[PDB]
Coordinates of C-alpha atoms in Angstrom, one line a residue:
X20 CA 0.0 0.0 0.0
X21 CA 1.1 3.6 -0.4
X22 CA 2.4 5.8 2.3
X23 CA 0.1 8.8 2.7
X24 CA -1.0 11.4 5.2
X25 CA -3.5 8.9 6.6
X26 CA -1.0 6.2 7.6
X27 CA 2.4 7.9 7.8
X28 CA 2.4 7.5 11.6
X29 CA 3.8 4.0 11.0
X30 CA 7.1 5.7 10.1
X31 CA 7.6 6.0 13.9
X32 CA 7.0 2.4 15.2
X33 CA 9.8 -0.1 15.7
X34 CA 9.9 -1.6 12.1
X35 CA 13.0 0.0 10.6
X36 CA 12.3 2.1 7.5
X37 CA 14.3 4.2 5.1
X38 CA 13.2 6.9 2.7
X39 CA 15.2 7.2 -0.5
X40 CA 15.1 10.3 -2.6
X41 CA 17.0 10.5 -5.9
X42 CA 16.0 14.1 -6.8
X43 CA 19.5 15.4 -6.4
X44 CA 21.5 12.6 -7.9
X45 CA 22.0 14.2 -11.4
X46 CA 22.8 17.9 -11.2
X47 CA 24.1 20.5 -13.5
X48 CA 25.2 24.1 -13.3
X49 CA 25.2 26.8 -16.0
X50 CA 28.5 28.7 -16.7
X51 CA 30.2 30.7 -19.4
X52 CA 32.8 28.9 -21.5
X53 CA 36.2 30.3 -22.3
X54 CA 34.9 31.5 -25.6
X55 CA 32.2 33.6 -24.0
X56 CA 29.4 31.1 -24.8
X57 CA 27.2 29.5 -22.2
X58 CA 26.9 25.7 -21.3
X59 CA 25.8 23.3 -18.6
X60 CA 28.4 21.3 -16.6
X61 CA 27.6 18.3 -14.4
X62 CA 28.2 18.9 -10.7
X63 CA 28.3 16.5 -7.7
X64 CA 25.0 15.1 -6.6
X65 CA 23.7 13.0 -3.7
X66 CA 21.4 10.2 -2.8
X67 CA 19.2 11.1 0.2
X68 CA 18.6 8.0 2.4
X69 CA 16.8 8.8 5.7
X70 CA 15.6 6.8 8.7
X71 CA 12.7 8.9 9.9
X72 CA 12.6 7.4 13.3
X73 CA 16.2 7.9 14.4
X74 CA 17.1 10.8 12.1
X75 CA 20.1 8.9 10.6
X76 CA 20.9 10.2 7.2
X77 CA 23.1 8.2 4.8
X78 CA 24.3 10.8 2.3
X79 CA 25.8 9.0 -0.7
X80 CA 27.7 11.6 -2.7
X81 CA 27.5 11.0 -6.5
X82 CA 30.7 12.3 -8.0
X83 CA 30.7 13.8 -11.5
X84 CA 33.1 11.0 -12.5
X85 CA 30.2 8.5 -12.7
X86 CA 28.6 10.5 -15.6
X87 CA 32.0 10.6 -17.4
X88 CA 31.5 8.7 -20.6
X89 CA 27.9 7.4 -20.3
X90 CA 24.7 7.4 -22.4
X91 CA 21.1 7.6 -21.3
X92 CA 22.1 9.4 -18.1
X93 CA 18.5 9.7 -16.7
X94 CA 18.4 5.9 -16.7
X95 CA 21.9 5.5 -15.3
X96 CA 21.1 7.9 -12.4
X97 CA 18.1 5.7 -11.3
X98 CA 20.0 2.4 -11.5
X99 CA 23.0 4.0 -9.9
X100 CA 20.7 5.1 -7.1
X101 CA 19.3 1.5 -6.6
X102 CA 22.8 0.2 -6.9
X103 CA 24.1 2.3 -4.0
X104 CA 21.0 1.8 -1.8
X105 CA 21.3 -2.0 -2.1
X106 CA 25.0 -1.9 -1.4
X107 CA 24.2 0.0 1.8
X108 CA 21.6 -2.4 2.9
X109 CA 23.9 -5.3 2.0
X110 CA 26.7 -3.9 4.3
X111 CA 24.3 -3.8 7.3
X112 CA 23.7 -6.7 9.7
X113 CA 20.2 -8.3 9.6
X114 CA 19.2 -6.5 12.8
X115 CA 19.9 -3.1 11.2
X116 CA 18.4 -3.7 7.7
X117 CA 15.0 -2.0 7.0
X118 CA 11.7 -3.9 6.7
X119 CA 10.8 -1.3 4.1
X120 CA 12.3 1.3 1.8
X121 CA 10.1 4.1 0.7
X122 CA 10.9 5.8 -2.6
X123 CA 9.9 9.5 -3.0
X124 CA 9.5 9.1 -6.8
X125 CA 7.5 6.2 -8.4
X126 CA 10.1 6.1 -11.2
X127 CA 12.6 4.7 -8.6
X128 CA 10.2 1.8 -7.7
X129 CA 11.2 -0.6 -10.5
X130 CA 15.0 -0.1 -10.5
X131 CA 15.2 -0.4 -6.8
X132 CA 12.9 -3.4 -6.8
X133 CA 15.3 -5.3 -9.2
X134 CA 18.3 -4.5 -7.0
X135 CA 16.7 -5.5 -3.7
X136 CA 15.8 -9.0 -5.0
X137 CA 18.7 -10.2 -2.8
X138 CA 16.6 -9.2 0.2
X139 CA 13.2 -11.0 -0.1
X140 CA 11.9 -9.6 3.3
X141 CA 12.5 -6.0 2.4
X142 CA 9.4 -4.3 1.0
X143 CA 9.8 -1.4 -1.5
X144 CA 6.9 1.1 -1.2
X145 CA 5.8 4.1 -3.3
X146 CA 4.3 7.2 -1.7
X147 CA 1.5 9.7 -2.3
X148 CA 3.4 12.2 -0.2
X149 CA 5.4 14.6 -2.3
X150 CA 7.9 15.2 0.5
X151 CA 10.3 18.2 0.4
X152 CA 13.5 16.2 0.6
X153 CA 14.9 17.9 -2.5
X154 CA 15.5 20.9 -0.2
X155 CA 18.2 18.9 1.4
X156 CA 20.7 20.6 -0.9
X157 CA 19.6 23.9 0.6
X158 CA 21.0 22.8 4.0
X159 CA 24.5 24.5 3.8
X160 CA 26.5 21.7 5.5
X161 CA 25.1 19.1 3.2
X162 CA 25.5 21.2 0.1
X163 CA 29.1 22.0 0.9
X164 CA 30.1 18.4 1.8
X165 CA 28.6 17.4 -1.5
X166 CA 30.3 20.3 -3.4
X167 CA 33.8 19.6 -1.9
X168 CA 33.7 15.9 -2.8
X169 CA 36.6 15.0 -5.1
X170 CA 35.5 11.3 -5.4
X171 CA 32.6 9.0 -4.5
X172 CA 31.9 8.7 -0.8
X173 CA 29.2 8.4 1.9
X174 CA 28.8 10.7 4.8
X175 CA 26.5 10.2 7.7
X176 CA 24.6 12.8 9.7
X177 CA 21.7 12.9 12.1
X178 CA 19.2 15.2 10.4
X179 CA 17.4 15.7 13.7
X180 CA 20.6 16.9 15.5
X181 CA 20.0 16.2 19.2
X182 CA 16.2 17.0 19.1
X183 CA 15.2 13.4 20.1
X184 CA 16.6 14.0 23.5
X185 CA 13.7 16.4 24.1
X186 CA 10.9 15.6 21.5
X187 CA 9.4 12.5 20.0
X188 CA 10.3 11.2 16.5
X189 CA 6.9 12.1 15.3
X190 CA 7.5 15.7 16.5
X191 CA 11.0 15.7 15.0
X192 CA 9.7 14.6 11.6
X193 CA 7.1 17.3 11.7
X194 CA 9.8 19.9 12.5
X195 CA 12.1 18.6 9.7
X196 CA 9.4 18.5 7.0
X197 CA 8.2 22.0 8.0
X198 CA 11.8 23.3 7.7
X199 CA 12.5 21.6 4.3
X200 CA 9.1 22.7 2.9
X201 CA 9.9 26.4 3.8
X202 CA 13.4 26.1 2.3
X203 CA 11.8 24.7 -0.8
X204 CA 9.1 27.4 -0.9
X205 CA 11.3 30.5 -0.3
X206 CA 14.9 29.5 0.3
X207 CA 16.1 33.1 0.7
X208 CA 13.6 33.9 3.4
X209 CA 13.8 30.6 5.2
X210 CA 17.5 30.8 5.6
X211 CA 17.0 34.4 6.7
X212 CA 14.7 33.1 9.5
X213 CA 17.3 30.5 10.5
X214 CA 20.1 33.0 10.4
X215 CA 18.9 36.1 12.2
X216 CA 20.6 35.7 15.6
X217 CA 24.2 34.7 15.1
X218 CA 24.5 34.2 18.9
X219 CA 22.6 30.9 18.3
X220 CA 25.2 28.7 16.5
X221 CA 25.3 25.4 14.7
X222 CA 27.4 22.8 16.6
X223 CA 30.1 21.3 14.4
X224 CA 28.3 18.0 14.5
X225 CA 24.8 19.4 13.7
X226 CA 22.9 20.8 10.7
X227 CA 20.6 23.2 12.5
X228 CA 21.1 26.0 15.0
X229 CA 21.0 25.2 18.7
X230 CA 17.6 26.8 19.3
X231 CA 16.0 26.4 22.7
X232 CA 12.6 24.9 23.1
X233 CA 11.0 28.3 23.3
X234 CA 12.9 29.5 20.2
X235 CA 11.9 26.4 18.1
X236 CA 8.3 27.4 18.7
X237 CA 8.9 30.9 17.3
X238 CA 11.0 29.5 14.5
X239 CA 8.3 26.9 13.5
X240 CA 5.7 29.6 13.7
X241 CA 7.6 31.8 11.2
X242 CA 8.5 28.9 8.9
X243 CA 4.8 28.0 8.8
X244 CA 3.9 31.7 8.1
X245 CA 6.3 31.8 5.2
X246 CA 4.7 28.7 3.7
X247 CA 1.1 29.6 4.3
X248 CA 1.5 33.2 3.2
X249 CA 2.8 31.9 -0.1
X250 CA -0.1 29.4 -0.3
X251 CA -2.7 32.1 0.5
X252 CA -1.4 34.5 -2.2
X253 CA -1.3 31.8 -4.8
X254 CA -4.8 30.3 -4.2
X255 CA -6.4 33.5 -2.8
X256 CA -7.7 31.8 0.3
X257 CA -7.9 32.7 4.0
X258 CA -4.9 31.1 5.7
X259 CA -6.5 31.5 9.2
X260 CA -9.4 29.3 8.1
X261 CA -7.2 26.3 7.1
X262 CA -7.6 23.3 9.4
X263 CA -4.5 21.8 11.1
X264 CA -4.9 18.7 8.8
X265 CA -5.0 20.9 5.7
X266 CA -1.8 22.7 6.8
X267 CA -0.2 19.3 7.5
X268 CA -1.2 18.2 4.0
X269 CA 0.6 21.2 2.5
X270 CA 3.7 20.5 4.5
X271 CA 3.9 16.8 3.7
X272 CA 2.8 17.3 0.1
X273 CA -0.4 15.2 0.2
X274 CA -2.0 15.5 -3.3

């Protein structure tokens, strides 16, 4: 069955699950060539693999060298993604392997299915939620680590920093999706919100600023305002009349 806003709560039980997003695997940049002309040039990408309960993020960096001399790159990127995900699962002991892998794009369903045939007990699931994981490259530390890569490599992070010491996984997932949705809606303004009080810093081993509990409330309130203001302007609707569930649907990307 599909993961949707009606059953996503299962992402927080004890059955190990991993989200896999390939949106940032194949990337290009536009620059001016030595002749004064303009062209696209491949740049490093990444496979976003996240455990929503523990916050563990397996960031597989895709180096431009993999595109080198290859054809049908859109196909190669999808199979390359399934290749790396299964290699990761294969390296993990049975007790740490996921019961299910949820793909953010249905196009990844088949390639991954083929590659996971070595693990009969691992279910591959599609989702109706158009999650904001692509915004991952808007998180400076992740973008930089990806950018500096001079060769293939995997880097691990806890996308929830140390939040689980004080809030539940369900609450942490809500905070993360809200942040990523805002980054995706208006990156400039979202980063502005996050960086408006330099006294609140980002630990070397974290991705987000060390906001206190009271500050997170104000931050989440502003991030939500940013998103809903945009929504209201576009659809010409009264934001203050939206139900909590409708707001949640916008954040998670349901429909």
